[PDB]
Design a protein around this ligand. Structure first.
Ligand code: ZN
Ligand code: ZN
Lengths: 60, 139, 17, 66, 47
C-alpha cells in the first residue's frame, strides 16, 4: 500500500508486529593492486525491524 | 416508443455509483438522460462526451465537480450531474425529442443499438473490481 | 438495491440558478 | 460503568440520583450532606453513590463516528 | 441480492463487499472493517 504510520491498536487488531524499520550508514570501502581504492557509502541501508515498547521515546 | 427508451435512461441513483469508475466515457456515451431546464418542462438530451466543471457541488452525500456534454438536437451547452431527473420518458417529451431530432437532421438510433447498449450497464454493474481501480478511487 | 427512489428527493433545475 | 438502577442490598432506586449528587458536589457540600439531601437514609443506599465510579464518561470518549 | 454491508474501522462509512475482494474502505485506504448488526430477532428477558 501507500506509506503510513502503524498505530498500536491497528497492530493489535491485525496480528501485526509493532516495529520500526531500522537503517544504518555503511561505507563499502575497498582497495586493490595499483593503489585503486574507494569508499562508496550506502546511506540508510535497511538492517531489520525492531519492536517498539508502547509509550516509549520512539513510540507514536 | 418511450418505454424501450427508458431502459437506457440513466437515473440519478446510478450515477452516484460510477462517479469514479473508469471506462466512463464508454458506457454512458450513447444513452439518454432526463435533464432539467426549467417550469415542469423537460427535454431528452444526448450524452455526447465527458466534461469537467470548475464547480464542486454536493449531491446528497457524495460530491462531484464533473460535467456532461449534453445536446438536445442542436442546442448544446454544459451540464452538471445534479439537474438530472429520476422521471422516466413521458409521451409529450418523447415526441418532443423526436421532433428535435427530425428537425436537426440527426438519425434516430436504431432499436438494435439501444438493445446492445442497455446491457453494457448491467455487465458494468456486476463487474469484479480485481484490478487497480480501488486505488484511483480513494485518490 | 438498484433504484430506490419512491417523486424523489427534490431534483434541482438548471434554469433555477 | 454506569450508576446502578437500585441499591443492590435494599432495592431503593438510586439511578436518578447520580446527576443530582454531582450537582450537589458542584455546590460546596460534603458528600455526607449530599447523600442526606437526596434522602439516602440507609448505609446500603449511601454506598451506591459514594462508591460508584463513573466509567461511561471515559467510554464516551471512544467515538464511533465524529 | 444482498452485498454484505461492512463498516470502515476509521471512516465509519458503509462499504459493499462481495467475495474475492480486497478488504479496503472505498473512502480512504484503511484495512479494518466490522460487520453491521444482524437482522434476526434479538430478544432479551430483562433478567
Ligand atoms: Zn466496486
Ligand atoms: Zn440501599
Amino acid at each position: 500500500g501507500a506509506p503510513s504510520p502503524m498505530m498500536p491498536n491497528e497492530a493489535r487488531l491485525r496480528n501485526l508486529t509493532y516495529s520500526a524499520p531500522l537503517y544504518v550508514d555503511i561505507t563499502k570501502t575497498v582497495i586493490k593492486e595499483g593503489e585503486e581504492q574507494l569508499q562508496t557509502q550506502h546511506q540508510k541501508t535497511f538492517i531489520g525491524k525492531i519492536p517498539i515498547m508502547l509509550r516509549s521515546t520512539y513510540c507514536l | 416508443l418511450p418505454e424501450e427508451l427508458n431502459r437506457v435512461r440513466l437515473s440519478r441513483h446510478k450515477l452516484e455509483r460510477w462517479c469514479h469508475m473508469p471506462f466512463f466515457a464508454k458506457t454512458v456515451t450513447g444513452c439518454f438522460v432526463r435533464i432539467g431546464i426549467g417550469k415542469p418542462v423537460y427535454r431528452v438530451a444526448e450524452i455526447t462526451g465527458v466534461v469537467e466543471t470548475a464547480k464542486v457541488y454536493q449531491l446528497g452525500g457524495t460530491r462531484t465537480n464533473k460535467g456532461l456534454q449534453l445536446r438536445h438536437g442542436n442546442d448544446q451547452r454544459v451540464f452538471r450531474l445534479e439537474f438530472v431527473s429520476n422521471q422516466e420518458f413521458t409521451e409529450s417529451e418523447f415526441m418532443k425529442w423526436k421532433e428535435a431530432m427530425f428537425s436537426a437532421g440527426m438519425q434516430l438510433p436504431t432499436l438494435d443499438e439501444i438493445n446492445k447498449k442497455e446491457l453494457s450497464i448491467k455487465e458494468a454493474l456486476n463487474y469484479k473490481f480485481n484490478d487497480q481501480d480501488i486505488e484511483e478511487i480513494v485518490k | 438495491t438498484s433504484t430506490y427512489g419512491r417523486y424523489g428527493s427534490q431534483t434541482p433545475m438548471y434554469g433555477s440558478g | 460503568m454506569i450508576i446502578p438502577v437500585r441499591c443492590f442490598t435494599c432495592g431503593k432506586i438510586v439511578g436518578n440520583k447520580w446527576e443530582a449528587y454531582l450537582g450537589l458536589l458542584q455546590a460546596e457540600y460534603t458528600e455526607g450532606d449530599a447523600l442526606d439531601a437526596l434522602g439516602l437514609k440507609r448505609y446500603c443506599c449511601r454506598r451506591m453513590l459514594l462508591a460508584h465510579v463513573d466509567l461511561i464518561e471515559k467510554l464516551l470518549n471512544y467515538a464511533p463516528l465524529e | 441480492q444482498q452485498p454484505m454491508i461492512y463498516i470502515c474501522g476509521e471512516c465509519h462509512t458503509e462499504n459493499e463487499i462481495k467475495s474475492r475482494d480486497p478488504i479496503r474502505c472505498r473512502e480512504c485506504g484503511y484495512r479494518i472493517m466490522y460487520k453491521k448488526r444482524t437482522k434476526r430477532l434479538v430478544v432479551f428477558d430483562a433478567r
